Amino acid sequence: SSLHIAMFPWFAMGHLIPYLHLSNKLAKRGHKISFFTPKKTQTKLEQFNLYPNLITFYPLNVPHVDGLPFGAETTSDVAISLGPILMTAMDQTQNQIELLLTQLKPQIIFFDFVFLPKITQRLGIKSFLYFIINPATISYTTSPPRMFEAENLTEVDLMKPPKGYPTSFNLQSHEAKHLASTRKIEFGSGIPFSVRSYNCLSLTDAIGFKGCREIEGPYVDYLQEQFGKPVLLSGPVLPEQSKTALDEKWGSWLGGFKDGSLVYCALGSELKLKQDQFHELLLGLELTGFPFLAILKPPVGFETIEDALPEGFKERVKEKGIVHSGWIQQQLILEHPSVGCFVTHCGAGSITEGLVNNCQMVLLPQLNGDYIINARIMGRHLKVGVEVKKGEEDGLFTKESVYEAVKIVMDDENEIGREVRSNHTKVRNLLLRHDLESSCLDTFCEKLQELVS
Ligand SMILES: O=c1c(O[C@@H]2O[C@H](CO)[C@H](O)[C@H](O)[C@H]2O)c(-c2ccc(O)c(O)c2)oc2cc(O)cc(O)c12
Numbered sequence: 377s378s379l380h381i382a383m384f385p386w387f388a389m390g391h392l393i394p395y396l397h398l399s400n401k402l403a404k405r406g407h408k409i410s411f412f413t414p415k416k417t418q419t420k421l422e423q424f425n426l427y428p429n430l431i432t433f434y435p436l437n438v439p440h441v442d443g444l445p446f447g448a449e450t451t452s453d454v455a456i457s458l459g460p461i462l463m464t465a466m467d468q469t470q471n472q473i474e475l476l477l478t479q480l481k482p483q484i485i486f487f488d489f490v491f492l493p494k495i496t497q498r499l500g501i502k503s504f505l506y507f508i509i510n511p512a513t514i515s516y517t518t519s520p521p522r523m524f525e526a527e528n529l530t531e532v533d534l535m536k537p538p539k540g541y542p543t544s545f546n547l548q549s550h551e552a553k554h555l556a557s558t559r560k561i562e563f564g565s566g567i568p569f570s571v572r573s574y575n576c577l578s579l580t581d582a583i584g585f586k587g588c589r590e591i592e593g594p595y596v597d598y599l600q601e602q603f604g605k606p607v608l609l610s611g612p613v614l615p616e617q618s619k620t621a622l623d624e625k626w627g628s629w630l631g632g633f634k635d636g637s638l639v640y641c642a643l644g645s646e647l648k649l650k651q652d653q654f655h656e657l658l659l660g661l662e663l664t665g666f667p668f669l670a671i672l673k674p675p676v677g678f679e680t681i682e683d684a685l686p687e688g689f690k691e692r693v694k695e696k697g698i699v700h701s702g703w704i705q706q707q708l709i710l711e712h713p714s715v716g717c718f719v720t721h722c723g724a725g726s727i728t729e730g731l732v733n734n735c736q737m738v739l740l741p742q743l744n745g746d747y748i749i750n751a752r753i754m755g756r757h758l759k760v761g762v763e764v765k766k767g768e769e770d771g772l773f774t775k776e777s778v779y780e781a782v783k784i785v786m787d788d789e790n791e792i793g794r795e796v797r798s799n800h801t802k803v804r805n806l807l808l809r810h811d812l813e814s815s816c817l818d819t820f821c822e823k824l825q826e827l828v829s
């Protein structure tokens with residue numbers, strides 16, 4: 377029988393988009409989806425709704441919170457430092473969420489962040505905490521062994537995995553320092569960041585993650601053993617095709633370059649670089665001599681790309697490089713045959729989009745636990761990309777380190793480049809295997825049915 381599932385993702389494009397990809401896959405199997413979205417953002421989401429008769433959007437008014445910029449609805453609307461205020465606004469949607477659940481009466485609600493399970497169990501609805509970040513990240517920072525240390529968890533503590541963690545990788549000093557401090561910072565309604573997610577993990581009926589057994593399996597197993605409740609896998613949430621073909625302006629421009637010759641660089645929809653690293657990144661791309669398309673916000677303190685470019689940059693790169701601030705159809709750009717290299721901030725959505733395509737991956741994780749852990753897994757475990765080197769204590773890169781990583785992967789005679797290409801091909805063949813995503817969804821839907829039994 378078909379399930380009625382409500383979707384309540386965090387107010388961020390990197391959560392809304394894969395939640396909607398998954399919504400489409402579930403609607404193809406006959407399930408009815410009630411998709412909760414901030415009101416103005418719904419217009420930008422319609423392009424991803426392939427089953428409008430089964431997936432219905434329900435708008436949420438993002439409430440005012442002192443400090444939240446007027447009209448803001450997603451993390452793409454606010455500086456990263458204002459994310460906690462947007463979380464307070466999510467928390468404050470509780471009244472309109474309660475109303476929606478009582479009228480719509482879904483069997484299950486998928487959610488982020490809102491530690492909701494008390495309301496749903498009052499209403500006889502099953503709560504499902506559904507992550508689109510890596511379960512390796514949650515396992516590393518939010519498993520019970522980490523939370524019982526409370527404020528005694530130091531940077532030295534975070535240089536080791538928690539007890540029982542299933543794999544090994546290394547963090548740099550500045551990364552463990554970042555994890556140790558930001559963990560304690562309030563993220564919405566006075567709740568420390570890791571406490572919030574741990575409360576969600578503890579109070580929800582079941583947990584799910586984007587991913588497959590072959591890659592995410594050890595982490596989901598560890599989390600199931602630690603929290604003693606089902607931790608499901610949805611499959612890798614392969615991107616669905618959009619109803620909008622590639623913008624002719626980009627299609628024309630990309631089509632002027634030889635196959636596999638262009639370096640595409642994008643650091644997602646949320647973050648802004650500081651000027652000095654913006655300069656180092658752009659000079660590093662220029663040094664390679666390959667054509668490039670860099671999708672970047674103007675750096676901190678600047679309002680236009682033009683004002684922040686290194687001196688003489690436009691004049692030198694001419695028509696071979698574009699640095700662009702606006703939202704583009706990244707999934708369609710990565711499919712274009714001109715693209716030979718993807719310099720990625722290692723957001724989990726961008727990683728999936730890179731892996732299912734042919735571009736060589738250069739890993740430039742920004743300062744966020746999931747980006748860093750995705751980068752270590754991709755660079756050291758799957759070995760599908762080359763990571764740009766950062767200073768151990770300062771977390772900064774040089775233009776020469778960007779140049780070096782791109783040069784390695786784009787050099788047909790470089791054996792590291794050939795290696796990461798071969799490994800990437802193996803991972804793409806896995807993720808696109810004719811029965812991989814379907815058998816993940818088969819198991820996923822069987823366990824959701826068990827949950828509502
Ligand atoms: O990046 C992490 C992350 O997601 C991001 O969190 C950012 C906070 O600044 C932004 O909000 C951003 O948009 C969002 O994607 C979540 C998270 C997601 C969904 C949940 O339901 C939830 O409970 C937790 O947990 C983490 C836990 C870590 O220890 C380290 C991490 O790096 C993350």
Ligand SMILES: O=c1ccn([C@@H]2O[C@H](COP(=O)(O)OP(=O)(O)O)[C@@H](O)[C@H]2O)c(=O)[nH]1
Pocket residue numbers: 388389390391393643644645646647671702703704705706707722723724725726727729
């Ligand atoms: O200009 C842009 C920026 C991002 N994306 C998409 O937005 C999502 C970003 O998710 P990810 O986890 O990679 O990064 P975030 O933006 O959340 O840091 C992915 O599906 C990207 O394809 C896009 O289409 N155009």
